[PDB]
Design a protein around this ligand. Structure first.
Ligand code: PLM
Ligand code: PLM
Lengths: 56, 278, 281, 278, 281, 255
């Protein structure tokens, strides 16, 4: 749960050196993210999820 | 199990460049924290036991609510026995947990929790009731009256629950005709042949008798009192010895019926958030 | 039995117990080459195999076409214009009018088969885009009518080799007299109602025009049944969705074609009889 | 364990002077009776077993009282299900016993004792009720109606207690995210940064999510009767396998809320007694 | 298992089971001497130690300043007039603007450290008094408002090196418009609400002007967590209370100064990033 | 290095200046006695100094070390607090251009890099503030211009680009440890600079051991365009940095 004490931190992406494209080339790139767990990950204390609601 | 120990690491100057990969292939990067950061040795105690399939499913979940009444003999209205077709698609939570995966072999454990209550303003007396819970496999006759021959349970297994005692419970093995329960089925049960009437061969999409488990009929054995007494049996289903195959992405929008359909206005799961905002 | 942290079983029944760029592959008389293909995905790490008698339900001697059916059939080509949302082909329903494989699957009652799908799409160094090819097992899709469920027809749910398309926005089939009974899968929901982002759980590859121009997927035979009817049940399903839109030299009308080449592998059949002549149009 | 035997002693004339010490250091005098008095040999039988940490905490203590009613369907007022945030700071006795020490790892054992009673003057009839006690960890949806989806307990553990049977009971392991429960926390959950709005970063003193254990929701499963029936679940908490660290001085003045605050007029614990008076 | 006065475990989960004067000490480039210091207290009999990998939560390589931060910093001096009730400094909040230790704790996210506190106060043979120095772990203090709880602000709860003071009598912060959100710990209650007499359970020493003029406390790192944020959580807390009031030659205005010298020991840090710039005034 | 990682897919190897990797002070050649404070991870990190545009009509830049890393993280704090300090460096110069760009930089790690003054009426008259720009660095001027102001001399460096400032010639400047960033071949240059000094350990606030000078050997050009710009970045990582002599913190006058 979004919690003040057990915060995770922050992640950001910046330009170190700008994207340089030659002429007759598209001038608007796109980057796609991906998030996964590493081999040391783990969870516990099963609970219910708020993403699904049986309306009425 | 003790997860892998986080081994130590230090400054490096090599050219292996494990950090950079190519996602074009279908293999995820096995990179670990020691590779891209100076890491200190750490003895690992955490274990993934709680997250296994059994521990993830080792909890009964309500799958239906069956209403059965015992109308007063004063009122001519007939008794209401509940016939519920066996399925886990009446609710969402168990359905959503199961629909992570495509196939599943799991023994089942059903628990029936019964409750009762008077309805007429007259605070009358009703002696302790006995409920019959009979399983009618696919084909066996469906009871049509609360006091017809079909309730003899000559071959249909049945439970007699005396209201006020510990909730009823029974286990069942894997009863699938196939080699695994088919949570999803892309196909039909009939193929519309080119040389027959259109009506013939018309079957609902993704509907097959793989999930054909018969019905469950619940009645109040007691003959009617002078005061109506309603009751509601709740069925809690626990998968035991569960094995699952072919994972899938969890449902994001609210369910709509047995299929994979979604309603018109439900197609907005995500929430507003500016791109550059922590 | 004193287990570590007294387990005694009292009931006979068990249910009562407690809890890389270069590639060239030849199938039959067909050969495929690709100098910039980023390796292959053996979906679920299982190569297609012939049915083993240890798990054999039917008794009838199986007819394995071998070379005559385990060939690479190139399905029709599709233009990847800028404003295109995706495509989906169900298998083996796609290979129903392809050579002798279609004849065998229509004649024989039961049939199993793995596949090798090669998605080919090549662009210049100056092109910009990326496709995602997912081999969805048991791929279901949502209907178009909110007044009914599971109402899609056989003809519309099995387009054949023409395939289907993903629609940008949902649109109910408001016609209550003669419902179209037609799939209306939203692109980002992937049709099933899930999210596209998670769709990477399925076996998948990405055709990133900067890096690779091909994607190979070796799909085994996954099914609750060892062998099942091929005219009813479509085991797998290929969904190609453009993760990043096509772009080229600031040009607002860039098109490139995408082709599929599917090769049944270790395909076996049983139950021969009169030939199925289904109604499809 | 047999405490040390009180060894014998006799007249002495040495210069060790063990009687005199210096309290300035932080070490208490280990002096024993034999040193300052002529002592006779005594075989020792007394043992400190009753005073160990387990024996000191091996007793359940009430930690809350949750009121849940079943209003008559005649009255339109909705049912009252009780949501109680898990904590041992609602009472004093268990809180005071625990706040001897600063940190504590203890498995828990919760027992629910339910009672019921009619409220309307009408002496009506109410069939035996079934109570659902569902644990909602931190984050899981909080039920808002007594008959909404959240009660399916698909993943949230839940107990169904049939009123009139033995009180419900369940054990729980150590669930602390840290390595020991923090009875006291000197700090905050946010640090007010010099370059942001004052409201942001403002958090209650000594408040952290270390004691964030979710809520406990109790409802009456039975649909409403014609007569209102109130009930009060009492939760008794027993620490098992308890280890404690960093003792402290027991509270002297009456508690005031979760923190270590004391009210204005409560600062007079001691009692009058003349200096020279036995 | 037949235990002495039949114990069978039926549930897999474990929770289901049944139930001396002379002293000279050198840290880095700093040295402390005291000819009449009455030995030292190793609080809880545990010397500070570097984090051991067997109980290491984070992975990042730890930055140990060693000599640059494990030095003796002398906090400001305070006059022990006759009518003074006590003082309290929270750690490591006191060493936040002291040399490189402050910089390291602000830069690094997580940080652990033990301390060596030397309290120095010297008086003539003709002076009369006695201090008690207690190293309260997790030292909380009561608020000033009876209308709210846990309402103290970060700025007021972390005075820094200036420290705080104990008030003789409680006084509610009656201002309901802009509450001061300020600690108001009563001297004899020790602030927490307990009694002063029992406060000797904490690690402690007594500076009795007749016998000794110094008090040394080696405080290990006690915390529910192996490593924790230093800007949020103040592990220890030093409370100096005069057990017996100062007196000298029948003089009604005797003052002597009390000084603190705190040396972080075995201080380790992790999680480097932009530097914390908190609001303190 | 520490919590910092640097990657470069087209970097043309590294130069270990003078073939000596930075090393901690060895007691066999240890002048002071005081126990040395080695920050290790907290100071041996990669700090990215500001970026500079390499327009067509730009003559060069120069950053003195460790004067550049004086307000960079804990390294600045350590060097200001401690009296004596030694350290090697790892300088990574990053500048990337398309296949259609045309140019070439030369990065020289000048030891004891001195620079000529601006006044012909006085010698060695430069001020501390002007001779230590910090991370902003300095620039080479195309043509010499005397500081004719005789009332309040600017006391400012005026190093001519081709003379390299010292008065020598640029062509010979390759005797120093150096690399070339040729945009056709490589876009990065790595230099591992050891600690060279007449003294085993010396004050870091007074003496600037090394000095990085980046001069464009061939001017930038692109598609016949007369205004091509690309940015150049520096990433410097102190290595095996040791300090001695702790005391009140130096608060120098710099502006
Ligand atoms: C009512 C008393 C007797 C009941 C006998 C057992 C009832 C269940 C038998 C069929 C269960 C098979 C379907 C469950 C699993 C699923 O549908 O995924
Ligand atoms: C209501 C039925 C299921 C209940 C499941 C167990 C409920 C307790 C789980 C959290 C307990 C952790 C907090 C107790 C110890 C403490 O706060 O000091």
């Amino acid at each position: 749960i979004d919690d003040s004490f057990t915060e995770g931190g922050y992640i950001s992406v910046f330009y170190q050196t700008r994207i340089v494209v030659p002429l007759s080339t598209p001038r608007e790139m796109d980057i796609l993210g991906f998030v996964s767990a590493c081999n040391d990950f783990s969870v516990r204390l099963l609970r219910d999820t708020t993403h699904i609601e049986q309306k009425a | 199990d003790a997860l892998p120990n986080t081994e130590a690491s230090g400054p490096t100057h090599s050219k292996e460049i494990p950090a950079l990969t190519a996602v074009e292939t279908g293999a995820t990067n096995p990179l670990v924290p020691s590779d891209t950061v100076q890491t200190r040795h750490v003895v690992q105690h955490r274990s993934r036991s709680e997250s296994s399939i059994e521990s993830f499913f080792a909890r009964g979940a309500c799958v239906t609510i069956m209403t059965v009444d015992n109308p007063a003999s004063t009122t001519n209205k007939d008794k209401l026995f509940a016939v519920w077709k066996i399925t886990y698609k009446d609710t969402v939570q168990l359905r959503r947990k199961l629909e992570f995966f495509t196939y599943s072999r799991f023994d089942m454990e059903l628990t029936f929790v019964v409750t009762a209550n008077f309805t007429e303003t007259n605070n009358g007396h009703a002696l302790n009731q006995v409920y019959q819970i009979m399983y009618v496999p696919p084909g066996a006759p469906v009871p049509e009256k609360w006091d017809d021959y079909t309730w003899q349970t000559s071959s249909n297994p049945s439970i007699f629950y005396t209201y006020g005692t510990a909730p009823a419970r029974i286990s069942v093995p894997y009863v699938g005709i196939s080699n695994a329960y088919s949570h999803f089925y892309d196909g039909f049960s009939k193929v519309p042949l080119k040389d027959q009437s259109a009506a013939l061969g018309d079957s609902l999409y993704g509907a097959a008798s793989l999930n054909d488990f018969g019905i469950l009929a619940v009645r109040v054995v007691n003959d009617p009192n002078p005061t109506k007494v309603t009751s509601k049996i709740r069925v809690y289903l626990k998968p035991k010895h569960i094995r699952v195959w072919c994972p899938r992405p969890p449902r994001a929008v609210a369910y709509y019926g047995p299929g994979v359909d979604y309603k018109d206005g439900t197609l907005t799961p995500l929430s507003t958030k500016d791109l550059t905002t922590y | 039995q004193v287990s570590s942290q007294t387990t005694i079983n009292y009931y006979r029944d068990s249910a009562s117990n407690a809890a890389d760029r270069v590639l060239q592959l030849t199938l039959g008389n067909s050969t495929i080459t690709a100098q910039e293909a980023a390796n292959s995905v053996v979906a679920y790490g299982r190569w297609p195999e012939y049915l083993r008698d240890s798990e054999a339900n039917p008794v009838d001697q199986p007819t394995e076409p071998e070379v005559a059916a385990c060939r690479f059939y190139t399905l029709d080509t599709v233009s990847w214009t800028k404003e295109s949302r995706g495509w989906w082909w169900k298998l083996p329903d796609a290979l129903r009018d392809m050579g002798l494989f279609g004849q065998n699957m229509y004649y024989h009652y039961l049939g199993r088969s793995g596949y090798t799908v090669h998605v080919q799409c090549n662009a210049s160094k100056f092109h910009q885009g990326a496709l995602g090819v997912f081999a969805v097992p048991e791929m279901c899709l949502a209907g178009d009518s909110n007044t009914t469920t599971m109402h899609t027809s056989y003809q519309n749910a099995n387009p054949g080799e023409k395939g289907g398309t993903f629609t940008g926005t949902f649109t109910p089939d408001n016609n209550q007299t003669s419902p179209a009974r037609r799939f209306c899968p939203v692109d980002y929901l992937l049709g099933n109602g899930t999210l596209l982002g998670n769709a990477f759980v399925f076996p998948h590859q990405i055709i990133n025009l900067r890096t690779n121009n091909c994607a190979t997927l070796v799909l085994p035979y996954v099914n609750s049944l060892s062998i099942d009817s091929m005219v009813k049940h479509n085991n797998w399903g290929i969904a190609i969705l453009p993760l990043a839109p096509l772009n080229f030299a600031s040009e607002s009308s860039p098109e490139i074609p995408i082709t599929l080449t599917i090769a049944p592998m270790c395909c076996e059949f049983n139950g021969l009889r009169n030939i199925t002549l289904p109604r499809l149009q």
